[PDB]
Amino acid sequence: YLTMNNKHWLVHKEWFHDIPLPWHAGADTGTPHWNNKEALVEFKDAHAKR
Amino acid sequence: NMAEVRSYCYEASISDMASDSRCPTQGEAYLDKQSDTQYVCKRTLVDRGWGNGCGLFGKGSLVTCAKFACSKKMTGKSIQPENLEYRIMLSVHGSQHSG
Amino acid sequence: IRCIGVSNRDFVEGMSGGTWVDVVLEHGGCVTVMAQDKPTVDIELVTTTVSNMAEVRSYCYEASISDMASDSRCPTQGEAYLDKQSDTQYVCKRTLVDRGWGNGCGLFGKGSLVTCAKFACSKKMTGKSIQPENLEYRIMLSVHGSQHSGMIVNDTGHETDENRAKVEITPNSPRAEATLGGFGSLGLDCEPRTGLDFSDLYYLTMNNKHWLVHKEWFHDIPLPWHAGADTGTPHWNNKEALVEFKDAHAKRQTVVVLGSQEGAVHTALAGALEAEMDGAKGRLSSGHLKCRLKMDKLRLKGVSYSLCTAAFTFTKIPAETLHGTVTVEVQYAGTDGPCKVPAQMAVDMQTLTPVGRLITANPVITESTENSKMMLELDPPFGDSYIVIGVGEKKITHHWHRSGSTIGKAFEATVRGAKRMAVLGDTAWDFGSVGGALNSLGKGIHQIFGAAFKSLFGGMSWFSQILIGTLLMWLGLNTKNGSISLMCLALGGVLIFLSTAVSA
Amino acid sequence: EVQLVESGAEVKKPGASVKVSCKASGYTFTSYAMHWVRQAPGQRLEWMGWINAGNGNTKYSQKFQDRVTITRDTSASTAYMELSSLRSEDTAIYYCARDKVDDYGDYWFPTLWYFDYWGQGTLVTVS
Amino acid sequence: EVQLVESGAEVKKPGASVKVSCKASGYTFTSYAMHWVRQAPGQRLEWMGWINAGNGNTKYSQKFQDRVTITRDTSASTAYMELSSLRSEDTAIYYCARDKVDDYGDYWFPTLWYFDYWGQGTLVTVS
Amino acid sequence: AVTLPSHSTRKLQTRSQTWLESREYTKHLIRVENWIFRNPGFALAAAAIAWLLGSSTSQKVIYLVMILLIAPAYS
Amino acid sequence: AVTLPSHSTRKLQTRSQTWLESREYTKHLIRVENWIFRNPGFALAAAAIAWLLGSSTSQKVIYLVMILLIAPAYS
Amino acid sequence: SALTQPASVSGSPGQSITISCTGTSSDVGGFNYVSWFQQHPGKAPKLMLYDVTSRPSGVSSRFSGSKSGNTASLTISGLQAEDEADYYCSSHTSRGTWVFGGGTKLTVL
Amino acid sequence: SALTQPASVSGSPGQSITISCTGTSSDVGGFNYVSWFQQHPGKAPKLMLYDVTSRPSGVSSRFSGSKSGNTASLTISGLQAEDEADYYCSSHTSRGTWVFGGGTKLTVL
Ligand SMILES: *[C@@H]1O[C@H](CO)[C@@H](O)[C@H](O)[C@H]1NC(C)=O
């Protein structure tokens, strides 16, 4: 089952294990340690200004 | 009776920024956040001039490490054949209509 | 000065043909102009202005859905309807799915159900439009000569400082006469109109980060466009794209939002322009300009002065900077007044006589005291050399060794010459000056092949560009006449090249 | 030529919202600059700043990463530094000074000089 | 020269119907067109007009959309605005002004100037 | 971002309607169209290229189909 | 939804950094690869199909490139 | 929907004053339709501008119009003593109707 | 990140005084950023150094800066009569924040 917000739908273990987003593992106590993160938070610069 | 096999954060809240700014041939910039765990860092090379103020000129090796955060993760909750069920119904026309 | 170690800087050596030099100014770098005489002016182009603007459409990211009140009818008392469709703020899809005897026809089969949702947005693009008039490319002028790299301080925004000079050139007033006190008035005539092909670029807002995109791209977005004329009651065209009516197979119909599409729109923006806005403009980075730089009125300033006296104490170790010059900044001590600054690159000392062609002509210190503060630049030869000012007793000498060979500067320079041909190309032939039957016939052919090419292969991402590159390559290894194989392999090779040059 | 004034930061109570203003005068603010340096009586000048310009950006000293902010209003060339909760130790003078901004309007590397002029100073007391 | 003159009405009690005349003088009728701009003293001018005297067409402000109706008479070269079901508030003075029609005789987009002349006014008051 | 996977490379086959089955296909085609509506030139180049390989008449057309379909979708 | 246009079909060419030029050009490639790592079977079928058209050797390989690239992206 | 015009203004003779008429994109911004009507109170209004920058023939030449964005600026210089006419800004909206601004009572000293 | 310069050193008119600012490799040593702020008891600390030296436009030759690693030495000689003020040494750390030494209040004559 794949829950986003208050809706739910089945997905296999290929589309679901193929997602680029952060991993997170099993549970959310406190705030979790987010695997990956490269997909979100894309940062680059030109002109060599910070 | 479902488990949770992984999660994805479909939203993002960046924070806290800062930057490195060490000169060329000073080696590397540190900034300690690459030590701590959720602060994403990508090291880039700022060709650095006298405005900043350094001895040589060329790739300057800084990275801004901004602290990641999440909101509203999508859970991947998983199941197995157990803890499943059906609840089938039966008809048998006979003579009825509505019960 | 104002451009050192700035990378993409390109210095043009000598205008030629009667004090006329044309140059292309792109934000990613500088241009430092040096003539046979006259100060060495360092032009650097910063920012761009977006003026009045205007809104074109809008797009919704996020769909609230309320109500959904439904209407069903019998197998035959037509298809369904309900009051809420005339509202036009709702969305309804009549799908014929339901059954008999359950609801009530005494007529097994069909059914028509209208399901109407209330559609209100939250976050939305404006998608403003740019027209070439009224945008002026701010441009900064920085002449070398006497200067620390601050110390004078006062910049030349309003003036004082007398070394630099801001110019804002707009298509309603080009020819930005710039007055550099005591050097000369450097006039320059730029075309703001024709450089970037605006009017093909809509200025695009999201939440804060703003972008520039094609009308061709911006009209093709599958969102419930708006018309952007006014609000008061925003009327959303479409609404169909962002909500989806999922009817269950056994019975009934559901209204389901597609949720915030926000990020997906970020993905679709791959390769925009990164843009900055403020209330009346929206600072535009990137860009490029074309300008004929008129050197007519200039003076070397104090060509006529003494050689100073004893000093030569220099503050720093020149610093071998990128591409060319070793940029020197001395402090002749004890000088009386506005006296010249002797500098020469010596192949051997020995009998003086340097060949260096330094790029900072007639350097001049300021007033009396001792604080002095003059910064220079010298282009030495690639071999070993001695940096020397040769005045007073025993002066002060320095030993310096450049790296790389004339072959290296040869390949290096055409490397970038190619990138000038690659990005912004078809104006790249405007980097050189006083051309005819070399640079114009050149820019002409390149402009025709450029228009055809862009028209032929538009729609090309980097990966695509490489693929079709290799296909044209493989044909270039085959077929016949040594023409379509050579023309084909040629054009394939240039895509591959434009790809790699884009990436680098 | 260049004037920087503030309105005085008297004394509030421990748990008070103090807002200090810096009125830029004469010198064109446009792309101007600013800073805030609070020093207590004969204190270790502290730099609790905000590199503001036209754009309204800020970067705070690790010490005030989330305690105080200073919004820009170019209607009057005024910067407002607001430190939430004036506790007792703050009695120090908050000066506003400028390090005029880079050409591009974006501020990263400051000028060689920092502060060419300074506010009059504001004594704000927690008592 | 160009002359516009009007009929000086009276109150005609709340709920009555005013009829004001604009008889154009000193220029060519057949290119006159016509407007009606209400004003009493102390508030903003409203434009409740119509725009076409060649064909007799009309366009009214959405406020007055159906209240006024307008007759043109070329024999008298006169346009008659008539405001039915007037109320206490519409105590005002009604000027008639011109913005010359394009030659096609169809009036869609005005001259760049609008009103080069004005009726001399008719103050209308409601009891 | 650049969420690659399109669940339709798998989907699931069942009596009931899947998520966006209609929106899905029409969408795949309407993407290609206002791709090529904005680059007729590439129809020229693709034409000459395809007609230059295979000599066999029809595959020619197969090459045009392959090339017109890959340019907008992947790349 | 399913916003079709990918702005790279035009981009803009300027010395300055485009939006996602890096993660762009690759996320193309890395999309194709797993897509292929999850369906080796289609590498078999695509292989036999391509190798049955054109008879010309290297034309074959063009067909496999044609088909392997068309399947994951353009449905 | 009346255009925004400020209530009133004064000052020394010869001195330039600026009257600001702010509309929306529906009218003042996406059109060059503007005019400022000098209305001598109790007398009939007259039109002191037309086509913005332009002026009718019988206009005192020291009136000047201007526009950028949504604005209409009537800038007068060396105000001669009898220049108090209630200034109303008016423009042609996109919908095909004309709207007169709130008007600026002009105050001479 | 802190500035440790000395608290107050005394010297007679004309003999030279030397204030030492000792920083980190993260600020003083790894950059050219140094500035010395003369703070009179009465007026706000004002600029009087900036980048090792380079007098701003009030040279009053008698002030000179220097650096040797993580040092900042402002050497004043020729005591400027009533030049007594607190002197603060400043630096731009690389983390992007400014730090100011503990100050050296000076004693003159
Ligand atoms: C700075 O500009 C002012 C005028 O605003 C001038 O009086 C002063 O001499 C200038 N100083 C320098 C170093 O340019």
- DSSP one-letter string for H42-69: TS-EEES-SSTT---TTS-TTEEEE-SS
E53 SS3 class: coil
Please tell me the residue having the least CA distance from ligand 1 atom 9: C160
Q: Does C278 touch chain D (CB under 8 A)?
A: yes
Q: Could you tell me which residues come within 8 angstroms of residue E125 by beta carbon, excluding any fewer than 6 positions away?
A: E10, E11, E91
Residues of chain C found within 8 Å of residue H69, distances taken between Cβ atoms:
52, 280
Please, are residues F42 and C458 in contact by the beta-carbon 8 Å criterion? Answer: yes
H100 SS3 class: strand
Sheet containing strand C397-401, edge to edge, reads C344-346, C384-388, C397-401
Tell me, using a 6 A CB cutoff, whether residue C154 lines ligand 1: yes
| Smallest CA–CA distance from C369 into chain I, residue | I61
Tell me, using a 6 A CB cutoff, whether residue C152 lines ligand 1: yes
Distance from the Cα of F10 to chain G's closest Cα (Å) equals 10
What whole-number distance in Å separates Cα of residue C310 and Cα of residue E116?
Answer: 80
Query: Kind of pairing, strands H105-106 and H63-66?
Result: unpaired
What whole-number distance in Å separates Cα of residue B73 and Cα of residue D124?
Answer: 45
C-alpha C250 to ligand 1 mean position (Å):
84
Tell me, using a 6 A CB cutoff, whether residue C149 lines ligand 1: no
Q: Could you tell me which residues come within 8 angstroms of residue C21 by beta carbon, excluding any fewer than 6 positions away?
A: C12, C15, C33, C292, C293, C295, C433, C434
Q: Which H or E run contains C430?
A: none
Tell me the torsion sign for CA atoms H48, H49, H55, H61: positive
Q: Could you tell me which residues come within 8 angstroms of residue G40 by beta carbon, excluding any fewer than 6 positions away?
A: none
Burial classification of residue C207, based on how many CB atoms lie within 10 Å of its CB (0-12 exposed, 13-18 middle, 19 or more buried): exposed
Please, are residues C293 and C275 in contact by the beta-carbon 8 Å criterion? Answer: no
Q: Could you tell me which residues come within 8 angstroms of residue C446 by beta carbon, excluding any fewer than 6 positions away?
A: C421, C425, C426, C428, C429
Residues of chain H found within 8 Å of residue E112, distances taken between Cβ atoms:
32-33, 50-51, 54
Q: Looking at domain D1-127, does it have CATH number 2.60.40.10?
A: yes
Count CB atoms within 10 A of the CB of residue G46: 20
Please, are residues H59 and H72 in contact by the beta-carbon 8 Å criterion? Answer: no
Taking CA atoms, H16 is separated from C164, C414, H77, H107, in Å, by 34, 58, 4, 13
Contact C458 G10 (CB under 8 A): yes
Distance from the Cα of C135 to chain D's closest Cα (Å) equals 16
Burial classification of residue B80, based on how many CB atoms lie within 10 Å of its CB (0-12 exposed, 13-18 middle, 19 or more buried): exposed
Query: Kind of pairing, strands E68-73 and B39-41?
Result: unpaired
Which is nearest to E126 in space by CA: E89, E94, E93, E95? E89
Q: Could you tell me which residues come within 8 angstroms of residue A23 by beta carbon, excluding any fewer than 6 positions away?
A: A34, A35, A36, B6, B7, B8
Structure tokens at H70: 């949504």
Count CB atoms within 10 A of the CB of residue A7: 10
Please, are residues B8 and A9 in contact by the beta-carbon 8 Å criterion? Answer: no
DSSP letters spanning C132-181: STT--EEEEEEE-SS--SSTT-S-SSSBTBSSEEEEEEBTTB----EEET
- Report yes or no on chains H and D touching (3+ CB pairs under 8 A): no
Q: Which H or E run contains E84?
A: none
Structure tokens at C479: 């077929």
What whole-number distance in Å separates Cα of residue G61 and Cα of residue C148?
Answer: 63
In the Cβ-directed half-sphere of H32, how many Cα atoms lie within 13 Å?
Answer: 11
What whole-number distance in Å separates Cα of residue B11 and Cα of residue C415?
Answer: 42
Distance from the Cα of I51 to chain B's closest Cα (Å) equals 10
Measured from the Cα of C159, ligand 1's closest atom is: 2
Taking CA atoms, F54 is separated from C316, C363, C479, in Å, by 68, 69, 11
Interface test with E, best of H50, H98, H99 (most E CBs within 10 A): H98
E47 forms beta bridges with E37
Q: Could you tell me which residues come within 8 angstroms of residue D16 by beta carbon, excluding any fewer than 6 positions away?
A: D85, D86, D126
Residues of chain A found within 8 Å of residue F12, distances taken between Cβ atoms:
10, 12
Residues of chain D found within 8 Å of residue I47, distances taken between Cβ atoms:
113-116
C472 forms beta bridges with none
Q: Could you tell me which residues come within 8 angstroms of residue H81 by beta carbon, excluding any fewer than 6 positions away?
A: H13, H108
**Max CA separation in chain H (angstroms):** 41
C292 SS3 class: strand
Smallest Cβ–Cβ distance between H100 and the set E44, E108, E116 belongs to E44
Please, are residues H72 and H88 in contact by the beta-carbon 8 Å criterion? Answer: no
Contact I61 C370 (CB under 8 A): yes
Q: Does C28 touch chain A (CB under 8 A)?
A: yes
Contact C55 H25 (CB under 8 A): yes
Interface test with G, best of C214, C416, C473 (most G CBs within 10 A): C214
**I25 DSSP assignment:** I
C-alpha I49 to ligand 1 mean position (Å):
18
Q: Could you tell me which residues come within 8 angstroms of residue C192 by beta carbon, excluding any fewer than 6 positions away?
A: C132, C135, C136, C137, C169, C170, C171, C174, C289
Residues of chain G found within 8 Å of residue F27, distances taken between Cβ atoms:
2, 4
Residues of chain B found within 8 Å of residue I96, distances taken between Cβ atoms:
18-19, 21
Please, are residues C163 and C302 in contact by the beta-carbon 8 Å criterion? Answer: no
Please, are residues C491 and C450 in contact by the beta-carbon 8 Å criterion? Answer: no
Which structural domain, as residue segments, surrounds residue C325?
Answer: 301-404
Burial annotation I50-74 (CB, 10 A radius, 16+ → b, else e): bbbbbbbeeeeebbbbebeebebbb
E103 SS3 class: coil
Please, are residues B12 and B40 in contact by the beta-carbon 8 Å criterion? Answer: no
Domain map (residue ranges) of chain F:
1-75
What whole-number distance in Å separates Cα of residue B10 and Cα of residue C263?
Answer: 9
Structure tokens at D49: 């700043």
D52 SS3 class: coil
Tell me, using a 6 A CB cutoff, whether residue C160 lines ligand 1: yes
CATH number of F1-75: 1.10.8.970
What whole-number distance in Å separates Cα of residue H26 and Cα of residue H92?
Answer: 9
Measured from the Cα of C154, ligand 1's closest atom is: 14
Structure tokens at H41: 């109170």
What whole-number distance in Å separates Cα of residue C6 and Cα of residue B84?
Answer: 66
CATH number of the domain that B53 lies in?
3.30.387.10
What whole-number distance in Å separates Cα of residue E53 and Cα of residue E36?
Answer: 13
Which is nearest to C199 in space by CA: C148, C113, C265, C131? C131
Please, are residues C404 and C382 in contact by the beta-carbon 8 Å criterion? Answer: yes
Residues of chain I found within 8 Å of residue D62, distances taken between Cβ atoms:
95, 97
How far, rounded to the nearest angstrom, does the alpha carbon of residue C315 sit from its chain's CA centroid?
A: 36
Burial classification of residue H64, based on how many CB atoms lie within 10 Å of its CB (0-12 exposed, 13-18 middle, 19 or more buried): middle
Q: Where are the beta strands (DSSP E) in chain B?
A: 7-9, 39-41, 47-48, 58-59, 65-67, 73-75
Q: Looking at this protein, which amino acid is placed at residue E124?
A: V
Please tell me the residue having the least CA distance from ligand 1 atom 10: C160
Q: Which H or E run contains B99?
A: none
Taking the CA atoms of residue C406, residue C409, residue C414 and residue C416 in that order, the dihedral angle to the nearest 10 degrees is: -170
Distance from the Cα of A48 to chain C's closest Cα (Å) equals 9
Please identify which residue in the block is written with the tokens 């009087």: I48
Interface test with C, best of G4, G15, G27 (most C CBs within 10 A): G15
**B51 DSSP assignment:** T
Tell me, using a 6 A CB cutoff, whether residue C366 lines ligand 1: no
**Which CATH architecture fits I1-109?**
Sandwich (2.60)
What whole-number distance in Å separates Cα of residue H95 and Cα of residue G43?
Answer: 62
Contact A46 G23 (CB under 8 A): no
What whole-number distance in Å separates Cα of residue B48 and Cα of residue C322?
Answer: 10
The structure's method of determination equals cryo-EM
Contact C244 F34 (CB under 8 A): no
Q: Where are the beta strands (DSSP E) in C258-365?
A: 274-275, 288-294, 344-346
User: Which ranges in chain H belong to alpha helices (H)?
Assistant: none
Contact F1 A42 (CB under 8 A): yes
Contacting B residues, span 41-60, partner chain D, CB-CB under 8 Å: 51-53
What is the best residue among C152, C153, C159, C160 to mutate for testing ligand 1's pocket, by most ligand atoms within 8 Å of CB?
C160
Taking CA atoms, D70 is separated from C438, C455, D8, D25, D46, in Å, by 58, 51, 16, 18, 16
Measured from the Cα of C161, ligand 1's closest atom is: 14
Contacting E residues, span 51-110, partner chain H, CB-CB under 8 Å: 59, 61-62, 95, 108, 110
Contact A9 F19 (CB under 8 A): yes
Contact A12 F10 (CB under 8 A): yes
Q: Where are the beta strands (DSSP E) in C307-403?
A: 344-346, 384-388, 397-401
Query: What are φ and ψ of residue A39, in 5° steps?
Result: -65, -55
Please, are residues F2 and G23 in contact by the beta-carbon 8 Å criterion? Answer: yes
Residues of chain D found within 8 Å of residue A50, distances taken between Cβ atoms:
108
Smallest Cβ–Cβ distance between I47 and the set D44, D61, D116 belongs to D116
Tell me, using a 6 A CB cutoff, whether residue I57 lines ligand 1: yes
